[PDB]
Homo-oligomer: A and B are copies of this chain.
């Protein structure tokens, strides 16, 4: 059985935080669906890179369930994710079935908006800490990648490779992650 990943892509998303996990996961043999929050139309990311999604979120929602749901960062992208009822439904369903939820940079603040994983240890971009910690519902970590139960978080664009390889390790195991890592020419 092939593992499946849902990447939710909204206007203002950080394009590096979107493309790196998608690329690395597909290198790992994972079937990745880049789903546009607003539909199938091309999405303008935070630094004006325009990415064409594979499907609308409405259509991808019907082809579940997914072994991981991935929330990229970018301040405005994360705000759009935080305001979407469709994202709320997807995340709550994923939480209930004990599937993996992965969010990077500003992305984790959507978990707060939708009341997902309260009590977990999480990290964010340093500039998103105060927002994430409103109410004290999580415990904050400064680790570059943090995994507490089914909640996997990471800090920023420069942690995107470590974030993506952590997803691969969680889904396909340490050996696949190591095999995928070698041709990337990462430092550590």
Contacts and interface: CB of A to CB of B under 8 A. Distances in A.
A123 to B, nearest CB: 10
Given A20-B20, A156-B184, 7 more contacts: A16-B16, A19-B49, A23-B47, A155-B185, A157-B184, A158-B184, A159-B185
Interface of A: 14-16, 19-20, 22-23, 26-27, 34, 42, 47-52, 125-127, 144, 155-159, 161, 183-188
Contacts of A158: 161, 184-187
A75 to B, nearest CB: 11
B16 A23 contact: yes
Task: Give the 5 A-B CB pairs with smallest separation, nearest first.
Answer: A156-B185, A158-B186, A50-B52, A158-B184, A158-B185
A181 to B, nearest CB: 8
A159 B187 CA distance: 8
Contacts of A185: 125-126, 144, 155-159
B51 A50 contact: yes
